[PDB]
Design a protein around this ligand. Structure first.
Ligand code: ADP
Ligand code: ADP
Ligand code: ALF
Ligand code: ALF
Ligand code: MG
Ligand code: MG
Ligand code: ZN
Ligand code: ZN
Ligand code: ZN
Lengths: 343, 366, 334, 360, 368
DNA sequence: TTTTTTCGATCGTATGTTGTAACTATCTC
DNA sequence: GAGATAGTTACAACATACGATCG
């Protein structure tokens, strides 16, 4: 199996085609761009007919198998596209894919698009069989650190002069949503044919459409960026995310920090990290968080979390978000007069 | 315990007994059916703790007494799989029965028959026998007036009353009443019972074209009907029923006579523009004249005029056209007699030819 | 379901009423867990559904007895929480009430058994109210509960209450010694922890509960000399958390009793731990910790889906905080 | 056999115990021809809401006419009593809560009554209906047709929408007093030919807490356990009536802060077997009596003469503020007694807290 | 035979409407000028008369004399509207007509011209109960309705409507009626009905109405039933005015003066009279609160209790605020403790004894 | 190199599958 | 040329999956 990235597909396609292609990832923009490039190359090579299906146990595989076995009246080199379910392949779906693999031939070109497969999902007889003659594309949304590089590359590709301040503004406003970034770049290019994208021009034609996850909120809390944490929490509230997931995500890290701080007085930090099986990249952030606050904090935080959970469940209240913001400020280096904690 | 079974004979009774059985078992043995052999017959019985259906098939080859339980789904699948015309040999060998279809031997798990909730002893408070035609006529003429889902649970069924040599079926739902009476030729004690919707509909479904008479026996808590080679047993609501004769209007002053077909056609034509949700019409009755008016929520109006035999004072009455149409269709006669008293009183409908059945409709007050 | 000897008297009373046709249509039996009220209710149901009873005992041969033994009697209804869940829904009550409107298939009585009325939701109880008020003829309702004060007042005010009490401590100890083989102090402590219920002590002995109690005692003995109570979390975080919280509460109460110079103590097998608790803790701190433990146990048993680990960790942290000088202890409120 | 609470249901206004104002208002309204189309009877548990509603329905749908004294013998009255009267539709409002039921019921309000003159919808336990059901009801309740009457009975009027309350005529029943309950019990027992004693009836009435159904249930318990005799001993045993000076001894020990004696008395009481709530109530009563004596020396009633002296001693030693503190502590202990691992544990915790309250 | 007062005394003209002057003036000006919008929303409490005003507007629009702010009330259109029989007044019960199918049918049948009137007025009642799909379907129709179509909406909870629907309508919020207007309306109705009445009975009924005039009419019907054709002060006090007696003020004064014997005598007298204990505590708390308000603002006390005004003012001049707060808190806590007390009378007695024991000026003597 | 949220009861919208009743067409009398 | 039997289409009822609000 040839592993590649969306930035390295044009050269491979120009060099030659392949029996099948697999597109796995999370970002819709890169996936659709790869799909479009592959389809354009196939059409240039004579693939005229294109058919699309969504993988689903409700959907019938008989039609797909008949299409694979059948031959068009006045066409050749058909293209078949399969959209995997968001949850992932099931045992029945795995068996159906294994059956389909045999039907594959030279003219038929299979393109699979779907979410990234887990370790168990990746382990499959059909996947292993096709690995010998398959090209896989890794499509992972770049992190905030990697985002400005991608934005600069996109601006250069479209022949746009983008300033550092404009790059930062675009990264902040449309973090985690590459499709919005691309559409904003297109709109800006249309607005000014000259292509001189100054900071005011971008500021006057940009809206807030960032997308975040609870893990990002917890990481921001650990870092201590109060503004970033508040922005992430506001975005999560706006998009309609249940606070239960946020609470459970924060609970694990809070308890881990409490335990480490309690045990840090007698054991080296590295030994504790090794015992608790923490990620290597997270060790620095964990150490910074531990050194940033003392046992006085991380104890009132537990009280806040318990009170918030009780209010959510027993009372079925609606002030959960205010308590979450207060806890976020408390985790950051803030006074937190402690009347709200109700100690 | 050797049993020889022909697919042709076994097919229909198996489907009949499996009918009431549903996908949801609700109990380990409820899905299973009880198969027993007595003298020279084999009885297959199935129940869901509310209604029981048992079918009997004659046996010719020698056999010995026995009784067991077999799952319905597996037996149905086995019967379906075998080619048509095949002969099935069934034997009892330990806790698992043996089925020998040609050279194919199958072992089917069997559960003890002592745990099957089957009635053992039956006591009949009142028993009789009638041709299928009479019972079918009574059920057809009285079924449409039963309530479907009402707080008054006693109105969710049909009242069967035996009085002297008369059998009476009564149905009511709070807005309309249907009473049907028929002689039976036998003297029976005065006794009234209530049968729920499920029992009545199942009895109607199993009942077919009149070939042989059916015998019905009603006990303290149950009713059992045997027809041909099937017996269906159900239980009763036992919630007491209002007296129908009280509901019937007393001394209806105004009498009207009309033709069934003409009135049916007039009502059908007027209902075209009638309200969809309510289906309300207004009847103005005057000397040898009947005017039917229908209004619509879309401001549409329809008017029709018909000639009848009437000589009383002019009256205006509101009604639901659907109920009147149903009554006319069920009556299925040539001449119809309508008895009414005032504009806020129930109206009775009967046949001029005979008074075997009667209906009552309560007008809508606006 | 075991028939304990001490249930013989009460039965002889209740059945007598049903022999005279004077039995109430709704019986509420109050008994601690392990008292065997379920066996009494089952015996009463068997007698009621029997077609040819032989005095106070079911014949065991009639069709009703056979069906009851097979657990397939059409006229027998039971309301219990679904598998995994710990509550009884409205749908089951509605189904039972709708079914009750029809006559019995076997032409006898209809018995409805509620395994635990305390698990009923408000909607279920309200639905069952009217049916209990005016049940159809030959319909009998049996209910069981531990504390009838928690049930809805309207539901309580339409049932005949029957209270069961455990035998004297000597009889229970003798019975346990006959059944279980342990030291006298251990048996007495188990019985007292069980609020005098012989059945519960047998359950505690049969299983790993005693090992868990020993582990908790060792952990508390280690923690009391120092200020490290958080280490108790490992001993507390478990499915049977309310029982361990109850054990800790009993230990604290025994420590307070010893502080006040009392004589009887719930725990009669760990005098050293009680002495250490009394020596190293003041009465006010003991009372505050006992109140916190009781409140947390009530919250865990009441709220549905509450996070066990977070609550226990917060409780332990607060307990450690209280021991520090100059801390305002809580005061009960109403 | 039918239980007493199900056999002695009132059948006429003459058989209703108490609730004089509601009966008088209904009689005046019926006599003056000012019948309303919506009645809401709100009251505590077991005060005859359903009975009053049924009697009102009988009066409205009597053959003789609209009268406040239904005959009870005409066919309509007999059918209503039996419960198979078509024009009287009794909703549960607890087994039928979904909007579909209410909507289909409100679509059958146009047809005239089958037999009677009014179509009576008796909605019992109406507080268990969803918001949609109430909103659907609203407009029909506001301006229903002439031949339809709505009767509502609830034990929790504050759970209903304000509009529903505003659309109905509210009748607030009052809890029955001890004397009325005792008289009703005596009359019922005399009719049933059952032996009784004044003390047993007084205790049952006091324990009824203003609910007649509870009183009848307790009477049935006594009859079943009393071998068909309502004797004082049986009632006291059932209710766990304290008779000796356990309460006074415990109060004295608690005041003296002698924990050893308090725990010994608790253990002895547990060995004997006593209802803890009754003991707490007795202690609260004794504390109130001591406070009253402190307010005025003549407050001490003759009933507690045997301990009068001792009581007075406490009135001469315990400051009133301490008495109030002990009373509130015992009250709080009583409130939290159900929500404790064990009743004995709750009692012990309350008494230990009271012992620790010593301000001197 | 007699029909209910609420239904009988329904305003059939803008002159019969009590209060709501701003909305009536706005509607009259709009009708006179001719600036008629196609979407009106009415909001407020219960019994304010949103439905009555909607019916009056419908009468005004569809009148044979033309679009007039003062409908004649005699033409056949007005008579039919009053009787609820007009063909061009489509009244929708949104409470029962919640599913989007009904809304789709209504919008499909909205293009046809009216039968007789010059407009086809859709009056949707309880619009807040509609599902979101119904609102979305109604959006565009409200945006550009046919010229001969007018929409009138009424609800009690406008906060749950979609923001777009609110933007697409002219909002009119009715405020609760004051005591004087309710009393005047009740007096006028009773005078028309030829029923004897007393001023204090009307005052009590108006105070118990709490804005909603329909509540006032229902209470008036209850009073008429209780008094057997007359509305007497005693009759009203029997059901509603069981509270508001001089006994509460006497008890408050005795407690302020630490007169234990007087308090005990008052308690005994109240028990003999058969006075509800919770009502007594409520009255004492209310009196303390009003004294506190008088201390804050001299204009707090209105004419409603003018009979005792002087006395109240005296209690404001002498009692320090802190003592009043202490008494209020003690009575509130005693109320918290009342349900669990062994007896209601015993609970009230204990509460008063606790109040006397901690009296700020002269506590009860301590043992020596 | 990877991590999965409270629960019960009630209301509303849209799609797919099965059974029964009503209406139409064809063959034999 | 008409009636009876068999086949096709339409309507009503039931089952499954997904989304939203309040206690
Ligand atoms: N005020 C009363 N007068 C007479 N009997 C009453 C009264 N209140 C309750 N009962 C008794 O309660 C039973 C009926 O219950 P009821 O009180 O009508 O239910 P609800 O709780 O709806 O008021 C009857 O057996 C009756 O004897
Ligand atoms: N402004 C008013 N003037 C006179 N009577 C009123 C007024 N508002 C309400 N009412 C009376 O209250 C009753 C109910 O009013 P209603 O139409 O329900 O108002 P809403 O729609 O605000 O509830 C009416 O029958 C009417 O007699
Ligand atoms: F019948 Al009740 F409260 F017991 F209404
Ligand atoms: F009819 Al309303 F508030 F408008 F009760
Ligand atoms: Mg009742
Ligand atoms: Mg209105
Ligand atoms: Zn038996
Ligand atoms: Zn009568
Ligand atoms: Zn006019």
């Amino acid at each position: 199996m040839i592993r590649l990235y969306p930035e390295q597909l044009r050269a491979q396609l120009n060099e030659g085609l392949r029996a099948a292609y697999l597109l796995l990832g999370n970002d819709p923009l890169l996936l659709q761009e790869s799909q479009d490039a592959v389809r354009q190359v196939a059409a240039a090579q004579g693939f005229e007919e294109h058919h699309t299906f969504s993988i689903d146990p409700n959907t019938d595989w008989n039609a797909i198998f008949s299409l694979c076995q059948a031959m068009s009246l006045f066409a050749s080199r058909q293209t078949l596209l399969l959209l995997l379910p968001e949850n992932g392949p099931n045992a029945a779906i795995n068996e159906q894919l294994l059956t389909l693999t045999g039907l594959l031939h030279d003219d038929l070109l299979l393109i699979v698009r779907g979410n990234k497969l887990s370790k168990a999902q990746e382990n499959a007889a059909w996947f292993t069989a096709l690995a010998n003659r398959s090209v896989q594309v890794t499509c992972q949304t770049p992190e905030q650190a990697q985002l400005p590089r991608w934005v600069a590359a996109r601006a250069k590709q479209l022949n746009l002069e983008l300033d550092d301040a404009a790059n930062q503004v675009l990264c902040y406003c449309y973090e985690g949503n590459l499709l919005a970034l691309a559409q904003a770049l297109e709109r800006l290019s249309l607005l000014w044919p000259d292509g001189k994208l100054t900071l005011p021009r971008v500021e006057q034609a940009v809206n807030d459409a960032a997308h975040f996850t609870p893990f990002h909120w917890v990481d921001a809390l650990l870092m201590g960026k109060s503004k970033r944490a508040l922005h992430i929490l506001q975005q999560l509230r706006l998009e309609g995310s249940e606070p239960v997931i946020l609470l459970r995500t924060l609970q694990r890290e809070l308890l881990l920090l409490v335990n480490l701080k309690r045990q840090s007085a007698h054991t080296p930090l590295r030994a504790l990290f090794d015992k608790h099986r923490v990620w290597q990249n997270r060790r620095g952030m964990m150490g910074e968080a531990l050194n940033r606050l003392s046992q006085t904090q991380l104890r009132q935080a537990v009280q806040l979390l318990t009170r918030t959970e009780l209010t959510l469940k027993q009372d079925y209240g609606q002030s959960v978000w205010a308590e979450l913001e207060g806890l976020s400020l408390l985790l950051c280096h803030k006074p937190l007069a402690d009347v709200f904690i109700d100690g | 315990m050797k049993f020889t079974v022909e697919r042709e004979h076994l097919l229909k009774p198996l489907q009949q007994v499996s009918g009431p059985l549903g996908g949801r078992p609700t109990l380990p043995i409820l899905g299973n059916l009880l198969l027993q052999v007595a003298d020279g017959t084999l009885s297959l019985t199935g129940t869901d703790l509310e209604m029981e259906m048992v079918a009997r098939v004659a046996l010719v080859q020698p056999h010995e007494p026995g009784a067991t339980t077999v799952p319905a789904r597996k037996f149905f699948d086995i019967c379906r799989g075998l080619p048509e015309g095949a002969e099935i040999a069934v034997q009892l060998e330990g806790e698992r029965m043996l089925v020998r279809s040609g050279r194919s031997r199958f072992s089917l798990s069997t559960l003890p028959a002592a745990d099957f909730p089957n009635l053992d002893d039956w006591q009949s408070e009142v028993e009789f026998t009638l041709p299928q035609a009479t019972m079918k006529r009574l059920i057809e003429a009285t079924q449409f007036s039963m309530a479907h889902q009402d707080v008054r649970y006693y109105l969710n069924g049909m009242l069967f009353e035996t009085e002297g040599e008369e059998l009476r079926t009564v149905a009511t739902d709070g807005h309309r009443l249907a009473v049907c009476s028929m002689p039976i030729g036998q003297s029976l004690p005065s006794h009234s019972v209530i049968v729920p919707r499920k029992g009545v509909i199942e009895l109607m479904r199993m009942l077919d074209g009149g070939d042989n008479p059916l015998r019905v026996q009603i006990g303290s808590n149950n009713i059992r009907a045997h027809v041909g080679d099937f017996i269906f047993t159900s239980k009763l609501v036992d919630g007491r029923f209002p007296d129908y004769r009280r509901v019937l209007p007393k001394n209806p002053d105004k009498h009207l006579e009309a033709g069934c077909d003409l009135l049916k056609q007039a009502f059908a034509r007027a209902a075209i523009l009638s309200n969809e949700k309510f289906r309300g019409v207004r009847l103005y009755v005057s000397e040898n004249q009947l005017k039917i008016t229908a209004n619509n929520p879309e401001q549409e109006e329809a008017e029709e005029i018909l000639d009848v035999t009437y000589s009383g004072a002019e009256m205006e009455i509101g009604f639901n056209v659907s109920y009147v149409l149903d009554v006319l269709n069920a009556l299925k006669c040539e001449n119809v007699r309508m008895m009414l008293t005032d504009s806020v009183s129930s109206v009775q409908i009967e046949d001029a030819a005979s008074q075997s059945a009667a209906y009552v409709v309560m007008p809508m007050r606006l | 379901m075991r028939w304990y000897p001490w249930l013989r008297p009460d039965f002889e009373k209740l059945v007598a009423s049903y022999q005279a046709g004077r039995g109430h249509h709704a019986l509420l039996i109050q008994a601690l867990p392990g008292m065997g009220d379920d066996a009494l209710i089952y015996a009463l149901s068997r007698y009621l559904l029997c077609q040819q009873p032989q005095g106070h005992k079911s014949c065991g041969h009639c069709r009703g007895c056979q069906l009851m033994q097979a657990g397939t009697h059409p006229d027998y209804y039971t309301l219990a929480p679904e598998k995994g869940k710990n509550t009884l829904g409205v749908d089951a009550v509605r189904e039972v009430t709708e079914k009750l409107n029809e006559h019995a298939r076997l032409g006898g009585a209809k018995v409805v058994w509620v395994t635990d009325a305390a698990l009923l939701t408000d909607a279920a109880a309200n639905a069952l109210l009217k049916t209990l008020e005016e049940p159809p003829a030959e319909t009998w309702f049996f209910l069981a509960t531990r504390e009838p004060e928690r049930l809805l007042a309207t539901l309580r005010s339409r049932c005949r209450l029957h209270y069961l009490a455990p035998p004297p401590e000597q009889y229970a100890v003798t019975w346990l010694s006959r059944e279980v083989t342990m030291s006298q102090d251990a048996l007495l402590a188990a019985l007292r922890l069980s609020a005098g219920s012989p059945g519960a002590a047998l359950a505690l002995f049969q299983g790993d509960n005693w090992q868990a109690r020993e582990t908790l005692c060792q952990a508390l003995a280690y923690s009391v000399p120092s200020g490290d109570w958080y280490s108790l979390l490992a001993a507390l975080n478990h499915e049977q958390a309310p029982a361990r919280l109850h054990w800790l509460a009993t230990l604290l109460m025994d420590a307070l009793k010893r502080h006040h110079g009392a004589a009887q103590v719930t725990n009669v097998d760990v005098p050293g731990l009680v002495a250490e608790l009394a020596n190293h803790l003041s009465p006010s701190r003991l009372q505050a910790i006992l109140g916190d433990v009781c409140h947390i146990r009530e919250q865990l048993m009441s709220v549905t889906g509450i996070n066990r680990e977070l609550l226990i960790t917060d409780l332990l942290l607060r307990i450690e905080h209280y021991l520090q000088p100059g801390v305002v202890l809580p005061v009960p409120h109403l | 056999y039918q239980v007493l609470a199900r056999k002695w249901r009132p059948q006429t206004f003459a058989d209703v115990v108490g609730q004089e104002h509601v009966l008088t208002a209904l009689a005046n309204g019926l006599s003056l021809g000012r019948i309303h189309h919506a009645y809401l009877f709100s009251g505590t548990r077991g005060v005859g809401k359903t009975s009053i509603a049924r009697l009102l329905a009988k009066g409205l749908n009597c053959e003789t006419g609209i009268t406040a004294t239904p005959c009870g013998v005409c066919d309509n009255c007999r059918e209503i009593e039996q419960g198979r009267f078509v024009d009287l539709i009794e909703i549960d409002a607890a087994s039928r809560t979904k909007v579909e039921d209410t909507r289909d019921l409100l679509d059958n309000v146009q047809y005239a009554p089958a037999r009677g003159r009014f179509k009576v919808y008796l909605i019992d336990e109406v507080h268990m209906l969803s918001r949609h059901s109430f909103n659907a009801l609203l407009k029909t309740l506001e301006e229903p047709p002439e031949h339809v009457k709505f009767l509502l009975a609830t034990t929790d009027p504050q759970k209903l929408p304000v509009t529903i309350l505003s659309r109905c005529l509210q009748f607030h029943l009052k809890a029955l007093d001890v004397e009325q309950i005792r008289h009703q019990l005596e009359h019922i027992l005399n009719e049933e030919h059952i032996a009784h004693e004044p003390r047993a009836l007084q205790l049952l009435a006091r324990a009824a807490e203003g609910s007649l159904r509870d009183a009848l249930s307790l009477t049935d318990q006594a009859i079943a356990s009393g071998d068909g005799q309502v004797s004082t001993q049986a009632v006291s045993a059932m209710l766990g009536t304290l008779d000796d000076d356990q309460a006074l001894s415990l109060v004295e020990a608690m005041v003296e802060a002698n924990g050893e004696r308090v725990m010994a008395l608790i253990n002895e009481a547990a060995a004997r077997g006593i209802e803890w709530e009754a003991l707490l109530v007795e202690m609260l009563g004794l504390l109130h009596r001591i406070a009253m004596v402190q307010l005025s020396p003549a407050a001490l009633g003759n009933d507690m003469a045997a301990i009068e002296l001792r009581m007075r001693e406490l009135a001469r030693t315990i400051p009133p503020t301490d008495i109030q503190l002990y009373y509130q502590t015992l009250l709080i202990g009583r409130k939290e007694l159900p929500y404790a691992p064990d009743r004995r544990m709750g009692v012990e915790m309350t008494l230990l807290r009271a012992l620790a309250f010593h301000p001197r």
